Write a protein that binds this ligand. Sequence first.
Ligand SMILES: *CCC(=O)NCCNC(=O)O[C@H]1[C@@H](O)[C@H](n2cnc3c(=O)[nH]c(N)nc32)O[C@@H]1COP(=O)(O)OP(=O)(O)O
Length: 170
Amino acid sequence: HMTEYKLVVVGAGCVGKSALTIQLIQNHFVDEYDPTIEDSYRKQVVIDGETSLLDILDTAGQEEYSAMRDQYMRTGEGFLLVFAINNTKSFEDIHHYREQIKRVKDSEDVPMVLVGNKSDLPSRTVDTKQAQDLARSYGIPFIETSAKTRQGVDDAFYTLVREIRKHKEK
Ligand SMILES: *CCC(=O)NCCNC(=O)O[C@H]1[C@@H](O)[C@H](n2cnc3c(=O)[nH]c(N)nc32)O[C@@H]1COP(=O)(O)OP(=O)(O)O
């Protein structure tokens, strides 16, 4: 009567992986480094009537190559690929994170969602159509988020859960 989902958040430094996680789990945000990430790893929530235990693994603080990152990529059932819409380099890095996950899984069909975070900020440098084209080429959804206003936060994590369900049922 509960179903666990193991969700992994990946992306360049400072894109908001940890803020997205804390907003989902604690309904909390601060515009600074948030030490409550240490306390923010499981949320129990009902999604489409299913009582779901969302275990969120946040790669913040890991080196770009580490044994713990590999453990996260091996255990994760779905991945959020996060970039920030005001940081072009973080968008350019998405290719690397996608390839790294695929190479661990030996699969071309891993549940993922592309997330463009910090959508509350003006002066974006990554346009939406760029991200839509990239997500289309990967076969995965794109969702714009803000960990500050909570724009898109439930949409991003719940969409990833629904992609996992589709994957499990064929
Ligand atoms: C990261 C460098 C930096 O910003 N340094 C200044 C101190 N402030 C922060 O670190 O702020 C963090 C978040 O509050 C902020 N953030 C995250 N998501 C945001 C959003 O949707 N809208 C706005 N306005 N700010 C947002 O970004 C900083 C980094 O977030 P993080 O969550 O700690 O980043 P990673 O885990 O991805 O490293």
